[PDB]
Design an enzyme around this catalytic site. Sequence first.
Site, short mmCIF file in Angstrom:
data_model
loop_
_atom_site.label_atom_id
_atom_site.label_comp_id
_atom_site.label_asym_id
_atom_site.label_seq_id
_atom_site.Cartn_x
_atom_site.Cartn_y
_atom_site.Cartn_z
N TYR A 397 17.26 -41.96 18.27
CA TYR A 397 16.52 -41.26 19.31
C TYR A 397 16.61 -42.06 20.60
O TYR A 397 16.30 -43.26 20.60
CB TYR A 397 15.04 -41.07 18.94
CG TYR A 397 14.73 -40.09 17.82
CD1 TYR A 397 15.71 -39.26 17.29
CD2 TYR A 397 13.44 -40.01 17.30
CE1 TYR A 397 15.41 -38.38 16.27
CE2 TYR A 397 13.14 -39.13 16.28
CZ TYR A 397 14.12 -38.31 15.77
OH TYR A 397 13.82 -37.43 14.75
N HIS A 479 10.94 -32.89 19.78
CA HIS A 479 9.93 -33.65 20.51
C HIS A 479 9.70 -33.19 21.95
O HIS A 479 9.51 -34.02 22.84
CB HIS A 479 10.26 -35.13 20.44
CG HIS A 479 10.23 -35.65 19.05
ND1 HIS A 479 10.69 -36.90 18.70
CD2 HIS A 479 9.78 -35.08 17.90
CE1 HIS A 479 10.53 -37.08 17.40
NE2 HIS A 479 9.99 -35.99 16.90
N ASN A 526 8.13 -41.02 17.48
CA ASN A 526 7.67 -39.66 17.19
C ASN A 526 6.29 -39.43 17.82
O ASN A 526 5.34 -40.14 17.51
CB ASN A 526 7.61 -39.40 15.68
CG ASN A 526 8.89 -39.78 14.95
OD1 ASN A 526 9.17 -40.97 14.76
ND2 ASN A 526 9.64 -38.78 14.50
C1 LIG Z 1 9.44 -29.77 11.88
C2 LIG Z 1 9.42 -30.81 12.99
C3 LIG Z 1 9.45 -32.17 12.65
C4 LIG Z 1 8.80 -33.15 13.46
N1 LIG Z 1 8.46 -34.38 12.92
C5 LIG Z 1 7.56 -35.22 13.53
C6 LIG Z 1 6.96 -36.38 12.90
O1 LIG Z 1 7.31 -36.82 11.61
N2 LIG Z 1 5.96 -37.03 13.56
C7 LIG Z 1 5.77 -36.79 14.85
O2 LIG Z 1 4.92 -37.65 15.56
N3 LIG Z 1 6.12 -35.64 15.39
C8 LIG Z 1 7.02 -34.82 14.75
N4 LIG Z 1 7.36 -33.63 15.35
C9 LIG Z 1 6.92 -33.37 16.74
C10 LIG Z 1 5.61 -32.59 16.80
O3 LIG Z 1 5.50 -31.60 15.79
C11 LIG Z 1 5.15 -32.07 18.18
O4 LIG Z 1 5.61 -32.87 19.25
C12 LIG Z 1 3.65 -31.90 18.29
O5 LIG Z 1 3.12 -31.41 17.06
C13 LIG Z 1 3.40 -30.91 19.40
O6 LIG Z 1 2.06 -31.02 19.86
P1 LIG Z 1 1.47 -29.85 20.74
O7 LIG Z 1 -0.04 -29.95 20.71
O8 LIG Z 1 1.99 -29.98 22.15
O9 LIG Z 1 2.01 -28.45 20.17
P2 LIG Z 1 1.88 -27.81 18.71
O10 LIG Z 1 1.70 -28.81 17.62
O11 LIG Z 1 3.16 -27.04 18.44
O12 LIG Z 1 0.62 -26.82 18.71
C14 LIG Z 1 0.69 -25.57 19.37
C15 LIG Z 1 -0.26 -24.67 18.64
O13 LIG Z 1 -0.67 -23.57 19.48
C16 LIG Z 1 -0.40 -22.33 18.78
N5 LIG Z 1 0.00 -21.47 19.83
C17 LIG Z 1 1.12 -21.52 20.57
N6 LIG Z 1 1.08 -20.54 21.52
C18 LIG Z 1 -0.11 -19.84 21.38
C19 LIG Z 1 -0.74 -18.74 22.04
N7 LIG Z 1 -0.11 -18.07 23.13
N8 LIG Z 1 -1.95 -18.34 21.59
C20 LIG Z 1 -2.58 -18.94 20.58
N9 LIG Z 1 -2.04 -19.98 19.94
C21 LIG Z 1 -0.81 -20.45 20.31
C22 LIG Z 1 0.68 -22.67 17.81
O14 LIG Z 1 0.65 -21.76 16.71
C23 LIG Z 1 0.35 -24.07 17.41
O15 LIG Z 1 -0.64 -24.12 16.40
C24 LIG Z 1 8.16 -32.75 14.65
C25 LIG Z 1 8.00 -31.37 14.89
C26 LIG Z 1 8.84 -30.44 14.24
C27 LIG Z 1 8.70 -28.94 14.62
O1 LIG Z 2 10.32 -36.29 14.20
C1 LIG Z 2 11.11 -35.83 13.37
N1 LIG Z 2 10.96 -36.21 12.01
C2 LIG Z 2 11.80 -35.73 10.97
C3 LIG Z 2 12.27 -36.91 10.08
O2 LIG Z 2 12.90 -37.87 10.87
C4 LIG Z 2 12.98 -34.94 11.47
O3 LIG Z 2 13.37 -34.08 10.40
C5 LIG Z 2 14.76 -34.04 10.16
O4 LIG Z 2 15.24 -32.94 10.90
C6 LIG Z 2 16.57 -32.59 10.70
C7 LIG Z 2 16.82 -31.34 11.58
O5 LIG Z 2 16.84 -31.73 12.98
C8 LIG Z 2 16.86 -32.30 9.24
O6 LIG Z 2 18.25 -32.08 9.08
C9 LIG Z 2 16.42 -33.47 8.39
O7 LIG Z 2 16.59 -33.20 7.02
C10 LIG Z 2 14.96 -33.80 8.68
O8 LIG Z 2 14.50 -34.91 7.94
C11 LIG Z 2 12.55 -34.06 12.62
O9 LIG Z 2 13.60 -33.20 12.99
C12 LIG Z 2 12.18 -34.88 13.85
O10 LIG Z 2 11.68 -34.11 14.88
#
Ligand SMILES: Cc1cc2nc3c(=O)[nH]c(=O)nc-3n(C[C@H](O)[C@H](O)[C@H](O)COP(=O)(O)OP(=O)(O)OC[C@H]3O[C@@H](n4cnc5c(N)ncnc54)[C@H](O)[C@@H]3O)c2cc1C
Ligand SMILES: O=C1N[C@H](CO)[C@@H](O[C@@H]2O[C@H](CO)[C@@H](O)[C@H](O)[C@H]2O)[C@H](O)[C@H]1O
Length: 585
Positions: A397, A479, A526
């Site tokens: 990253y 992110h 993260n």
């Molecule tokens: C699958 C994936 C893996 C990741 N892994 C990591 C990790 O291991 N650790 C880490 O620190 N971060 C990780 N992240 C990053 C992280 O998920 C986000 O950066 C963080 O959760 C976003 O915070 P937020 O409050 O800005 O938005 P969000 O967490 O996305 O919250 C937005 C919320 O508002 C709701 N919403 C959106 N629009 C509306 C609307 N118009 N009306 C009503 N409700 C609404 C949504 O349903 C959601 O519940 C990852 C995220 C993804 C998707």
């Molecule tokens: O913060 C994160 N944490 C997890 C773990 O580092 C990441 O997940 C990965 O995300 C990849 C997709 O971007 C997958 O291929 C992989 O299996 C999966 O572990 C995720 O995409 C990243 O946003």
Amino acid sequence: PVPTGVSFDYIVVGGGAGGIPAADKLSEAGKSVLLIEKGFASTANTGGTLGPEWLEGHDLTRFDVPGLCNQIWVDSKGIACEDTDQMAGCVLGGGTAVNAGLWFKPYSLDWDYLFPDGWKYNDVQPAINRALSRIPGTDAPSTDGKRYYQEGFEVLSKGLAAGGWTSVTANNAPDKKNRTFAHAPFMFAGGERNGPLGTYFQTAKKRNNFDVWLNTSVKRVIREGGHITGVEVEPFRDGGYEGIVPVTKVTGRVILSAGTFGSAKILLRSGIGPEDQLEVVAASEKDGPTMIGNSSWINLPVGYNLDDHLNTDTVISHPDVVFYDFYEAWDDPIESDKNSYLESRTGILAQAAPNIGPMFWEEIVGADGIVRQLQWTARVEGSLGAPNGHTMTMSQYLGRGATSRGRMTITPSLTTIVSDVPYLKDPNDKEAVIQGIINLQNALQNVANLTWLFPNSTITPREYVESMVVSPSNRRSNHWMGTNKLGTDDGRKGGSAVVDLDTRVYGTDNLFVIDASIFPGVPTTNPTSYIVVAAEHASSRILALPDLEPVPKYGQCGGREWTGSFVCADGSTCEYQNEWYSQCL
Ligand SMILES: Cc1cc2nc3c(=O)[nH]c(=O)nc-3n(C[C@H](O)[C@H](O)[C@H](O)COP(=O)(O)OP(=O)(O)OC[C@H]3O[C@@H](n4cnc5c(N)ncnc54)[C@H](O)[C@@H]3O)c2cc1C
Ligand SMILES: O=C1N[C@H](CO)[C@@H](O[C@@H]2O[C@H](CO)[C@@H](O)[C@H](O)[C@H]2O)[C@H](O)[C@H]1O
Ligand SMILES: *[C@@H]1O[C@H](CO)[C@@H](O[C@@H]2O[C@H](CO)[C@@H](O)[C@H](O)[C@H]2NC(C)=O)[C@H](O)[C@H]1NC(C)=O
Ligand SMILES: *[C@@H]1O[C@H](CO)[C@@H](O[C@@H]2O[C@H](CO)[C@@H](O)[C@H](O)[C@H]2NC(C)=O)[C@H](O)[C@H]1NC(C)=O
């Protein structure tokens, strides 16, 4: 169907990493708080029921079990948000419901470097202490404190130590982010996802001054000039609310927690953002007829400053590495692992998918004298089409110090797109990426039987990077940050800031943004822990503001440079005169 006589001191829109802690802290203050959420109940402790059959009757959902977290990549329907071109959780908990759960105590430099005064490290450190009290990490989420399938970890970790890198317990030494490696810390507790859903939301949901509306999407805020009177909702699923719910008269506030894309969308639908984008909303099928008129529009760089970690994958293969198939764990989990998890909350399933191996970091001074932050996530899995068995993926990253930025915009469908890809606009960003791969190769060069698949030995790190396509599809870290940037430079005057130090939207008295969207850039790590910290901090700044004071009749209630109250005393209304003046009349 929004109730006859109900209003709230605070309305927090979105149940994610920003919104849940904000709504919890604000309702803890005794103020009346309504949390509106697009999606449905997720973890079992929010009453979610959704998951595979082997969980049935065990008080668990797909969102509770760490080893099931990668399902979201093959099965997202009705869970992932559909109004964006990127990956976001649209259930309760937002991204924290579906992410991998990695949780980091902040690196002080991230706040000092990225944020203006009032948000620097000295400023948010109390907030850091609150968030990490609510959620301490664990780098051994298995409730017996053992870690499982560590073969791969021990491979790379031993390699790194020989290469001159230092072992730390990451969250005991938050500031040691250079030439450092560690067991991956998670927000898990009791072997379960936990997080904000497990802490903040649980304390909140016990309060009678707290209300949640699930299955309810916020279309926009309703406002007279710069004073938000309510928020307009429609059902996203059955049992959501249709209507306009008001905030306490004069004194009431709205907080947008809907995420980097979702909060920006709401602002745009509310006539807040760049002219060209507001003009897109105004022309739209859905919103054109009912959008607030173009003379009430507030021009802010909503959707600018789009930022994310630049992800660059690397793959190695080593004979001691042991793959675990977390996908086959959805339907047909290895029975002993199923057993130790269900009875004892222990075993490989208490660890996030795929097995998330050594975590490590380094800081590289570039040619421009700018220090750029690298984080590597090692996990046991193939990435670039490497086979799954003995491989480990090492994902670089590029974080804080990177200068490149993109832009988010809105479609005529009112869905968000990354229309200007953020990554690698500036050559010195690329140099750091290349140098990091080189640096890693040096560290791991004495490891026996270690093979480099990606890049293979015949491709230079530079060539390897140069070859890669730069796109969110293959380079995103999920992110996304920065579309409503926090800052002292008022966006109405051409500045880069959408919200001020109190997270108040410029041009408004009562509208705020607490989520990923306000970060001027991405941190070392993260971001979830950082976003929670920002909520701890922003909610305290908000709580310490004096109650809003209405303007007396004939007093100025608005204008494009107005800093004040936009709301008028009883017996007069705010009336627009020109772009520089509104008066109570
Ligand atoms: C699958 C994936 C893996 C990741 N892994 C990591 C990790 O291991 N650790 C880490 O620190 N971060 C990780 N992240 C990053 C992280 O998920 C986000 O950066 C963080 O959760 C976003 O915070 P937020 O409050 O800005 O938005 P969000 O967490 O996305 O919250 C937005 C919320 O508002 C709701 N919403 C959106 N629009 C509306 C609307 N118009 N009306 C009503 N409700 C609404 C949504 O349903 C959601 O519940 C990852 C995220 C993804 C998707
Ligand atoms: O913060 C994160 N944490 C997890 C773990 O580092 C990441 O997940 C990965 O995300 C990849 C997709 O971007 C997958 O291929 C992989 O299996 C999966 O572990 C995720 O995409 C990243 O946003
Ligand atoms: C929000 O919508 C979800 C899904 O439409 C509802 O959850 C379902 O509720 C039915 C019966 O109440 C159950 O049989 C399903 O198993 C549930 N599905 C899921 C995914 O949870 C939920 O009831 C709605 N919530 C509100 C407050 O209206
Ligand atoms: C992170 O640690 C490494 C190693 O301790 C530092 O590397 C030194 O960098 C300078 C120039 O930046 C070189 O002249 C030295 O020869 C390097 N030493 C070694 C042992 O490699 C690196 O500078 C540190 N990063 C930061 C931002 O402090």
